[PDB]
Amino acid sequence: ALSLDQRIQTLAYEELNKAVEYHQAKAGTVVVLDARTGEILALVNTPGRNRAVTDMIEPGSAMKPFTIAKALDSGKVDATDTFNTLPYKIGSATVQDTHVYPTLDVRGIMQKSSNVGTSKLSAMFTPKEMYDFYHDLGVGVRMHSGFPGETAGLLRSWRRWQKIEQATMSFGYGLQLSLLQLARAYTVLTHDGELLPVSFEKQAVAPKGKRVIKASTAKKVRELMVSVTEAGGTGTAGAVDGFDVGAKTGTARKLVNGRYVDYKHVATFIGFAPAKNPRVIVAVTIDEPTANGYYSGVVTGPVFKQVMGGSLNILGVSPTKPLT
Ligand SMILES: *[B@@]1([O])OC2=C(C([O])=O)[C]=[C][C]=C2[C][C]1[N]C(=O)[C]([N]C(=O)N1[C][C]N([C][C])C(=O)C1=O)C1=[C][C]=C(C([O])=O)[C]=[C]1
Known part of the structure; x- marks a missing residue:
């Protein structure tokens, strides 16, 4: 028997399709995991292969919460620490944000989704320490989910990284994974710092996870990620009435075998709830929206919202705070 939950699978399907239509997008995916077991409660695509x-x-x-996770886990950075977040140079290259903040603390980097900040956090560690970390989240590793055609994604060896590549990787370029690997990776945050295996099958035994960061770190990062969905953050479109939601937006220019083209984007929105004691991860990705803008927030936010809200209703999780 499958872990899939028809009500949720139906909900995801309806909501993905409304969005991919509304935004005249080329393709889309939604994944819902059990946050504490790695079971796939829903997995849905626009018609075609299992993207x-x-x-x-x-x-x-969407990679940024891990870089922060790693920094805090190390003991070398505390959430309250302030960083110069102005554009800067890695030799010949320039790291910069869309909107420029002179300084941010760690919560601001998360909240405002700062490349500069994230790359400074990364810059405090070796190529090897960051590759080992990405590797332990499952980047470049086979999940063995049993799905046909399962990609392992892409993690180039640290042994051949320029300094610019350490940076761009810390804020999510240069390495690749499936939306399911990405959702799986978030089990580190939701399952108290342990990476769960994913499964399309109901587990008789509750599955064990491999420890990657301490529980207290996961706990803190979840707290920080709530900033994303509160006023001031990138991800307010994904707030759900009656709950705190940890989420991260991502708006990426498209890599088309080699070159970045800048009028083409991929919107992803991923998060969990209840933020303090999470039950589900929802990951949404929409490929190349043409109509009504391209920011994660506008495109994937509403679908995250509906699916998360509907998912906690269906599993019978009680609101942690009164409905507005
Ligand atoms: B990230 O995705 O978070 C984010 C959001 C969000 O959270 O939804 C919204 C606006 C900006 C950002 C910063 C992050 N995205 C980008 O930096 C993105 N940059 C890129 O796509 N690239 C690809 C190529 N390389 C390596 C060669 C890069 O370093 C790079 O920057 C970006 C930049 C600008 C815009 C835009 O249109 O304003 C969107 C996305």
Whole structure:
């Protein structure tokens, strides 16, 4: 028997399709996991192959919570620490944000989704320490989910990284994974710092996870990620009435075998709830929206919202706070 939950699978299907239509997008995917077991409660694609497991993307901004996770886990950075977030140079290259903040603390980097900040956090570690970390989240590794065509994604060896590549990788370019690997990766945040295996089958035994960061770190990062959906953050479109939601937006220019083209984007929105004691991850990706803008927030936010809200209703999770 499958872990799939028909009500949720139906909900995801309806909501994905409304969005991919509304935004005149080329393709789309939604994945819902059990946050505490890695079971796939829903997995849905626009008609065609199972993109959620066969296709690989650059995570972009959705990678940022891990870089922060790693920094805090190390003991070398505390959430309250301030960083100069102005544009800067890695030799011949320039790291910069869309909107420029002189300084941010770690919560601001998460909230405002700053490349500069994220790359400074990364810059505090070796090529090897960051590759080992990405590797332990499952980037470049086979999940063994049993789906046909399962990509392992792409993690180039640290042994051949320029300094610019360490940076661009810390904020999600240069490495690749499936939306399902990405959702799986978030089990580190939701399952108290342990990476769960994913499954399309009901587990008789509750599955064990491999430890990657401490529980207290996961706990703190979840707290920080709530900033994304509160006023001031990139991801307010994904707030759900009656709950705190940890989420991360991602808006990426499209890598088309080699070159970045800048009038083409991929919108991804991923998060969990209840933020303090999470039950589900929802990951949404929409490929190349043409109509009504391209920001994660506008495109994938509403679908995240509906699916998360509907998912916690269906599983019978009680609101943690009164409905507005
Ligand atoms: B990220 O995705 O978070 C984010 C959001 C969000 O959270 O939804 C919204 C606006 C900006 C950002 C910053 C992050 N995205 C980008 O930096 C993105 N940049 C890229 O796609 N690339 C690809 C190529 N390389 C390596 C060669 C890069 O370093 C790079 O920057 C970006 C930049 C500008 C815009 C835009 O149209 O304003 C969108 C996305």
